[PDB]
Design an enzyme around this catalytic site. Structure first.
Site, PDB file in Angstrom:
ATOM      1  N   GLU A   1       0.842  -1.204   0.000  1.00  0.00           N
ATOM      2  CA  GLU A   1       0.000   0.000   0.000  1.00  0.00           C
ATOM      3  C   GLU A   1       0.880   1.259   0.000  1.00  0.00           C
ATOM      4  OE1 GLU A   1      -0.675   2.930   1.811  1.00  0.00           O
ATOM      5  OE2 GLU A   1      -2.131   3.358   0.212  1.00  0.00           O
TER       6      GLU A   1
ATOM      7  N   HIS B   1      -8.310   1.499  11.804  1.00  0.00           N
ATOM      8  CA  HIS B   1      -8.224   2.867  12.317  1.00  0.00           C
ATOM      9  C   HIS B   1      -9.558   3.350  12.888  1.00  0.00           C
ATOM     10  CE1 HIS B   1      -4.160   3.709  10.991  1.00  0.00           C
ATOM     11  NE2 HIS B   1      -4.444   3.071   9.871  1.00  0.00           N
TER      12      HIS B   1
ATOM     13  N   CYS C   1       2.638  -0.430   4.652  1.00  0.00           N
ATOM     14  CA  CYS C   1       1.461   0.361   4.356  1.00  0.00           C
ATOM     15  C   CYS C   1       1.821   1.828   4.628  1.00  0.00           C
ATOM     16  CB  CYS C   1       0.327  -0.174   5.230  1.00  0.00           C
ATOM     17  SG  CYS C   1      -1.269   0.316   4.626  1.00  0.00           S
TER      18      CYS C   1
ATOM     19  N   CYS D   1      -0.791   4.411   5.871  1.00  0.00           N
ATOM     20  CA  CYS D   1      -0.851   4.144   7.317  1.00  0.00           C
ATOM     21  C   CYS D   1       0.319   4.789   8.070  1.00  0.00           C
ATOM     22  CB  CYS D   1      -0.817   2.645   7.555  1.00  0.00           C
ATOM     23  SG  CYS D   1      -2.384   1.855   7.803  1.00  0.00           S
TER      24      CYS D   1
HETATM   25  N1  FCO Z   1      -2.425  -3.215   9.558  1.00  0.00           N
HETATM   26  C1  FCO Z   1      -2.344  -2.121   9.170  1.00  0.00           C
HETATM   27 FE1  FCO Z   1      -2.291  -0.308   8.592  1.00  0.00          FE
HETATM   28  C2  FCO Z   1      -0.407  -0.177   8.817  1.00  0.00           C
HETATM   29  N2  FCO Z   1       0.732  -0.115   8.931  1.00  0.00           N
HETATM   30  C3  FCO Z   1      -2.654   0.076  10.244  1.00  0.00           C
HETATM   31  O1  FCO Z   1      -2.948   0.352  11.309  1.00  0.00           O
HETATM   32 NI    NI Z   2      -2.858  -0.073   6.185  1.00  0.00          NI
END
Ligand code: FCO
Ligand code: NI
Ligand code: SF4
Ligand code: SF4
Ligand code: F3S
Ligand SMILES: [Mg+2]
Lengths: 544, 262
Positions: free
Chosen positions: A20, A74, A538, A541
């Site tokens: 990501e 989240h 990620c 994130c």
């Molecule tokens: N799993 C996930 Fe996303 C990340 N790094 C979050 O919290």
């Molecule tokens: Ni994530």
């Protein structure tokens, strides 16, 4: 013998694909081995800044958009965060429902990561076309549970489809693949490539089902819409027909986990045993997940079925309790203003300040989270070491199983191979617990359907929300003032794993793990991908 | 071998939730789409190549003799010469500009690419913009946070085989965005009878009363959520939660506070 060139010089990989978000990796290489590394996050959005002055009830809906891969997590961390700030303990049904949705997220997220993000680092798809579909079926009937998807007929059909696709000249997502023409770092027999590729395609169908299951409780996927301050909104999710469909979908997903994911994982791990000596780090942190008591952050830490803890210097004999006051973030090597180092998240500061590309003094949009001066690996490998060290029965049984099957010591898990195995290990364990967790909630919801507690917004307060998301230890922290958001800070698993150097100049987990990486072919540095992908990056994130 | 239309998919300031939404398609499934219908020639989330290899796959796609269609996911951060959002050492605005220039068509997947989205919300530190605004080009907008894969894939198929669909004033295909969430909501008779939940813990909530008093934005949001559902099973109001208005431009600022109507 692990292939490695004589290459000396820089290598930049940007974009890092099959993650990501937006990641640039820079390394210095000497004699075919990585000698230095930098993890450089390439996008900033500023959710923490956006949240200032807003309704605390609104936080979850903004913060969920930190990530659509780890969707939900989240929203859950923010809800836990605000629940803690307003000092409300959620009803038992809400704890159960929120935890099952997390379980469903782990199943969806890990399965897609292994097949659709990670496997292409280890599997040569074009070599699958060299396999005899019959020899491959025979091989699959000896390394895995019996299944029609694994028949010579089914494998030939996969091979035929791939052949027609490649011979078309339009390779699509396989254009310029590092394995095109063969690669020294790709060890798998063509037959294993074919089996893995067939499952890659099946996994594309199976993840739809994993998401449907999640959406029964979550309202939709991606981006769930069932959590509220004081619990959950989804009364229908406590009833009999949806929970029976939830059970059935989960069982289909877990059959695929047991029949395909774990056996593929172990087959790959078997051929890449040298990767059990590459990419290790020393410190591990988890906030734990799947708690029987989520009345408070302290209760979460204490009663998480996947336990919390802190391991330092690879010492499985000394798991420490999590000190939430010892968490802080540095910005020395990040694109933020001077003077923001050493901030506990309750005092967090987000003042973006960009310089230039590949400025060794400032090279990432991620902050650098530290724990008493030390960097911490978070995620499945962290959870696995902690649970194992504490003698969590499911983890102990599955880890030792894997160690027995691979014929390696537990110390070989401090590695990129270990990191990858750990993700599969906890997936099997989540799967083994689903029916019990669903029964618990069905039984409870049928006796009493209380799902949300009454609560009042305080004038001034603070709270923290903890979760162990698929990528690891996640925390949301709020200061409320005048009934509004005065400060809201996210500290996210990828920030822990993939952020830059801290104020001491100390490398992050991913940067440390990258040192000693062998590079067979600097033109096509798949080994960098293998280690980076193993952390399940990620970036949206990590930066938010 | 029949040649399949080239699709280039760019990721800018985004959460990858739109990519995730897309792969939940079941008519057809994503594998069938990319093996039989389109040639998905660049897509950072799932593509094999990385770094310079990936950059070269993009260039090859952009220089393809048969042309290409462009999908854009995410908004464009414009502060500091676009340097707060980069890929391969280039500002996102720059690459999206270059790819749009020659595209047969542009589909914006999600409220971010369509309208600027979450990063554009006040005070917008990155000076994020939607695509049409940042580049000055006409876009086919598939908004929602994320949109239904039914809407995205339907638009893609339609544009490949029939042409540009009829759009409303905000660039959205009337096929999917022509009706209010509210008009197809099963709680509508509650709304009409002024039967509202005052809180989520209330008996009214348990009885599935309307969620207007709890901030529901269905009456002002265009989407097909109650009619098509998500994941073949559910939608937010069925899950007892108000609509956020997530397919509307700038909903982050126009629809907030989420739990109120003010
Ligand atoms: N799993 C996930 Fe996303 C990340 N790094 C979050 O919290
Ligand atoms: Ni994530
Ligand atoms: S529209 Fe929503 S789901 Fe799609 S990229 Fe933007 S924030 Fe993510
Ligand atoms: S819950 Fe929302 S969409 Fe449904 S009738 Fe009430 S206001 Fe309209
Ligand atoms: S929040 Fe979005 S997904 Fe549908 S129900 Fe409202 S438009
Ligand atoms: Mg932060």
């Amino acid at each position: 013998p692990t292939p490695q060139s004589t290459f000396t010089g820089p290598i930049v990989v940007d974009p890092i694909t099959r993650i990501e978000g937006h990641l640039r990796i820079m390394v210095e290489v000497e004699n075919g081995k990585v000698k230095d590394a930098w993890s450089s996050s390439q996008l900033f959005r500023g959710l923490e800044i956006i949240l200032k002055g807003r309704d605390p009830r609104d936080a979850q809906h903004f913060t969920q958009r930190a990530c659509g891969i780890c969707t939900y997590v989240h929203a859950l961390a923010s809800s836990r965060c605000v629940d803690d700030a307003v000092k409300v303990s959620i009803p038992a049904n809400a704890r159960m429902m929120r935890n099952l949705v997390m379980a469903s997220q782990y199943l969806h997220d890990h399965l897609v990561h292994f097949y659709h993000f990670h496997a292409l680092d280890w599997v040569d798809v074009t070599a699958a076309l060299k396999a005899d579909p019959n020899k491959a079926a025979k091989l699959a009937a000896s390394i895995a549970p019996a299944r029609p998807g694994n028949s010579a007929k089914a494998l030939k059909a996969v091979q035929d489809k791939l052949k027609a696709f490649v011979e078309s000249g339009q390779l699509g997502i396989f254009t310029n693949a590092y394995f095109l023409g063969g690669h020294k770092a790709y060890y798998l027999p063509p037959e294993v490539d074919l089996i893995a590729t067939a499952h890659y395609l099946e996994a594309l169908h199976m993840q739809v089902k994993a998401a449907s299951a999640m959406a029964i409780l979550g309202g939709k996927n991606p981006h769930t819409q069932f959590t509220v301050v004081g619990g959950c909104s989804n009364y229908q999710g406590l009833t009999k027909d949806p929970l029976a469909n939830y059970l059935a979908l989960s069982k289909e997903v877990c059959q695929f986990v047991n029949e395909c994911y774990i056996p593929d994982l172990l087959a790959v791990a078997g051929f890449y045993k040298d990767w059990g000596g590459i990419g290790g780090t020393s410190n591990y942190l988890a906030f734990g997940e799947f708690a029987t008591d989520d009345s408070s952050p302290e209760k979460h830490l204490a009663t998480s079925q996947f336990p919390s803890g802190v391991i330092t210097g690879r010492d499985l004999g000394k798991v420490d309790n999590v000190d939430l006051g010892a968490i802080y973030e540095d910005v020395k090597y990040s694109w933020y203003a001077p003077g923001g180092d050493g901030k506990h998240p309750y005092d967090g500061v987000t003042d973006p300040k960009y310089t230039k590309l590949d400025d060794k003094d400032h090279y990432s949009w991620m902050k650098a989270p530290r724990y008493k001066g030390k960097a911490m690996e978070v995620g499945p490998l962290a959870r696995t070491f902690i649970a194992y060290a504490k003698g969590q029965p499911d983890f102990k049984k599955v880890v030792d199983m894997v160690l027995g099957k691979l014929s390696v010591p537990a110390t070989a898990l401090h590695s990129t191979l270990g990191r990858t195995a750990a993700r599969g290990i906890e997936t099997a364990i989540v799967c083994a617990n689903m029916e019990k967790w669903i029964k618990e909630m069905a039984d409870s919801g049928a006796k009493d359907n209380t799902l949300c507690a009454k609560w009042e917004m305080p004038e001034e307060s603070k709270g923290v929300g903890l979760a162990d998301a698929p990528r690891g230890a996640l925390s949301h922290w709020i200061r409320i003032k005048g009934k509004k958001i005065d400060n809201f800070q996210l500290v996210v698993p990828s920030t822990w794993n993939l952020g830059p150097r801290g104020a001491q100049g100390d490398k992050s987990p991913v940067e440390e793990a990258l040192i000693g990486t062998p590079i067979a072919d600097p033109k096509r540095p798949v080994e960098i991908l293998r280690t980076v992908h193993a952390f399940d990056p990620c970036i949206a994130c990590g930066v938010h | 071998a029949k040649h399949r239309p080239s699709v280039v998919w760019l990721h800018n300031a985004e959460c990858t939730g739109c990519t995730e939404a897309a792969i939940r398609t079941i008519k057809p499934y994503i594998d069938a789409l990319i093996l039989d219908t389109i040639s998905l020639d660049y897509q950072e989330t799932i593509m094999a190549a990385a770094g310079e290899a990936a950059e070269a796959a993009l260039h090859q796609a952009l220089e393809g003799k048969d042309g290409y269609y462009l999908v854009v996911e995410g908004g464009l951060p414009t502060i500091d010469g676009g340097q707060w959002g980069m890929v391969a050492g280039h500002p996102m605005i720059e690459t999206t500009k270059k790819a749009a220039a020659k595209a047969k068509g542009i589909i914006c997947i999600g409220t971010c690419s369509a309208y600027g989205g979450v990063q554009k919300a006040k005070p917008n530190p990155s000076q994020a913009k939607g695509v049409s605004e940042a580049l000055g080009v006409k876009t086919i907008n598939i908004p929602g946070c994320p949109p239904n894969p039914i809407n995205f894939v339907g638009a893609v198929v339609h544009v490949l085989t029939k042409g540009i669909p009829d759009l409303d004033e905000n660039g959205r295909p009337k096929l999917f965005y022509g009706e209010l969430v509210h008009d197809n909501c099963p709680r509508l008779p509650h709304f009409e009878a002024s039967e509202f939940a005052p809180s989520f813990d209330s008996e009214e909530a348990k009885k599935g009363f309307c969620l207007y008093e709890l901030g529901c934005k269905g009456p002002v949001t265009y989407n097909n959520c109650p009619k098509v559902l998500f994941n073949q099973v559910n939608w937010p109001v069925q899950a007892g939660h108000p609509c956020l208005g997530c397919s509307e431009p700038d909903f982050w600022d126009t629809m907030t506070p989420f739990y109120e109507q003010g």
